[PDB]
Structure 1
Amino acid sequence: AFAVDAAKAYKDYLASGGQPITNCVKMLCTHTGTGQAITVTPEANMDQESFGGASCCLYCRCHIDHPNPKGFCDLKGKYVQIPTTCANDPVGFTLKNTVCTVCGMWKGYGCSCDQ
């Protein structure tokens, strides 16, 4: 019945003015990529930075179990594209945001499936 809520702890710590997790691994890339959120190689466009996935995953970085019941991580082994305006906190961004199942862009940061 009891489980640490890692997401909630970090979201609250952020709001209390805590320093975002650092040492997310930022990649060198052309910045001419598709812009999709989670890719097998870096896909940043001119508005995004590309990072190594694992270093941007709250569960990977905190040495705790993943929410997926079989323990699968969405980010490890891939690259997450982060809007340049949020690249100060890649971990928070990926926690607080959602990927569109249709076009693979961040809902609200690339997804335009409502037009």
Structure 2
Amino acid sequence: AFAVDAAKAYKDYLASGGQPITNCVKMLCTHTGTGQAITVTPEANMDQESFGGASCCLYCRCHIDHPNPKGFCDLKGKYVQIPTTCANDPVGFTLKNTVCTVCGMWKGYGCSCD
């Protein structure tokens, strides 16, 4: 019945003014990409930074199991695009937000399916 809740703990830590996880791995790119959220190669547009996925994944970075019965990571081995305004905390961003399964952009940060 007991399973540690790391997402909740990071969100609470952040809201207390704790400093966001650093050393997220930012990539050099053209910044002329599709802007989709999670891609096989860096795809930042002019409003985004692209990062190596593992380094932006809370579970990867904290050495804890992934929330997924198979243990699969959505980010490792891919690149995550993060709005440049939020790139001070790529881990917080990927945790709090969600990817539209239709167009592949971040809901509210690219997704226009409304």
Shorter-chain TM-score category? over 0.9
Distance 1:68 1:80 in 2: 19
TM-score, L = length of structure 2: 1.00
For the aligned residues, what is the CA RMSD? 0.2
Distance 1:5 1:108 in 2: 25
Task: Say whether residues 1:18 and 2:25 are aligned partners.
Answer: no
Cα displacement (A) at 1:22: 0.1
Cα displacement (A) at 1:66: 0.1
Cα displacement (A) at 1:43: 0.1
Distance 1:61 1:2 in 2: 21
Cα displacement (A) at 1:106: 0.1
TM-score, L = length of structure 1: 0.99
How many positions carry a matched residue from both structures? 114
Distance 2:72 2:31 in 1: 28
Distance 2:108 2:13 in 1: 23
Cα displacement (A) at 1:100: 0.1
- Counterpart secondary structure, 1:27: coil
Q: Percent identity?
A: 100
Cα displacement (A) at 1:61: 0.1
Cα displacement (A) at 1:58: 0.1
Which ranges of structure 1 fall in alignment gaps of 5 or more residues? Answer: none
Cα displacement (A) at 1:56: 0.1
Which ranges of structure 2 fall in alignment gaps of 5 or more residues? Answer: none
Q: How does 1:1-115 map to 2 (within 5 A)?
A: 1-114=1-114
Distance 1:84 1:100 in 2: 19
Map Cα deviations across residues 44-64 of structure 1 (whole Å, 9 max, x no partner): 000000000000000000000
- Counterpart secondary structure, 1:80: strand
Map Cα deviations across residues 9-40 of structure 1 (whole Å, 9 max, x no partner): 00000000000000000000000000000000
Cα displacement (A) at 1:98: 0.2
Map Cα deviations across residues 75-96 of structure 1 (whole Å, 9 max, x no partner): 0000000000000000000000
Flag as ranges the 4+ runs of structure 1 deviating above 4 A: none
- Counterpart secondary structure, 2:106: coil
